[PDB]
């Protein structure tokens, strides 16, 4: 996102506005304002690696922009919007991730390595790779009888078509010691 | 299947191992995934966008 302080009506502020957005959700419901739009109306820009070197970025648009004038004891502990040169803002951090990792629920709550495992195992699992399996003659292939969509989810899943083609089941689970088996 | 289409391979080398490449770089933020990569063998040489 491009932040340019072009607000002669306040501080530094994101070029994209609540209308731009609502103007987009307008087109979502139609299934004319694309991504390309956001890109031509110069509101979002592609910053490679090298260029990334000379810019400043705010994680959350809100969080890291207004002024400072209590804090939730259960919530985590974010640093702060210490800066006024912000020139770009992160669409959403959850996008540092790549497919695999994105299906992991609450990764921001695991010892880093555990995440790197579920990233490789979620590839050994069984699901429904396509809806035309019935007509494909590939060597070997497994389809799970009754796939269910996970109760726990990721906003990023919706794009990975996970709810439409799951790969597991929600099982009533107990965490106890029993027979010993 | 998605995840495979977004896969990257990095030539090995002789002294192969060390760290330098196999490690997660800072510039890696936002372009490559921090968690998804194979265990052992060619760990950190195969990256996922």
């Amino acid at each position: 996102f491009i932040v340019e302080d072009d607000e002669s009506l306040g501080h530094k502020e994101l070029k994209v506005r609540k209308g731009h957005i609502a103007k987009l959700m307008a087109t979502e419901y139609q299934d004319e304002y694309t991504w390309s739009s956001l890109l031509n109306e110069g509101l979002v820009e592609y910053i490679d690696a090298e260029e990334e070197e000379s810019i400043l970025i705010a994680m959350q648009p809100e969080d890291l922009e207004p002024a400072e004038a209590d804090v939730d004891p259960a919530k985590r502990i974010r640093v702060s919007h210490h800066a006024t040169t912000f020139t770009h803002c992160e669409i959403h951090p959850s996008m540092i991730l790549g497919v695999a990792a994105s299906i992991i629920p609450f990764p921001d709550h695991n010892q880093s390595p555990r995440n790197t495992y579920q990233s490789a195992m979620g590839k050994q699992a069984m699901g429904v790779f396509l809806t035309n399996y019935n007509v494909r003659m590939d060597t070997m292939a497994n389809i799970l009888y009754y796939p269910q969509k996970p109760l726990g989810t990721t906003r990023a899943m919706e794009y990975l078509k996970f709810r439409e083609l799951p790969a597991g089941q929600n099982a009533i689970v107990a965490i106890a010691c029993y027979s010993g088996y | 299947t998605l995840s495979h289409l977004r896969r990257t391979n990095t030539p090995i080398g002789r002294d192969g191992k060390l760290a330098k490449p196999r490690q997660l770089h800072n510039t890696h933020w936002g372009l490559v995934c921090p968690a998804e990569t194979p265990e052992g063998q060619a760990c950190g040489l195969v990256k996922n966008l």
């Binding site: 502020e13 994101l14 994209v16 506005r17 609540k18 209308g19 731009h20 957005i21 609502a22 103007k23 987009l24 959700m25 087109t27 979502e28 304002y33 694309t34 991504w35 390309s36 956001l38 979002v44 959350q60 648009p61 809100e62 922009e65 669409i91 959403h92 996008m95 497919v99 906003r155 919706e158 794009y159 990975l160 | 998605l2 289409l5 977004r6 966008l49």
Partner: peptide, 30 residues
């Protein structure tokens, strides 16, 4: 007021529009 700021939940609308166009496999194709 088609010009107010923009909170969290709003980010998605953009992202949603991203993939609406480019798609998970963009790069390979282009």
């Amino acid at each position: 007021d088609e010009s107010a700021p923009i909170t969290a939940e709003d980010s998605w609308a953009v992202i949603s529009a991203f993939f609406r166009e480019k798609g998970l496999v963009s790069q390979q194709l282009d």
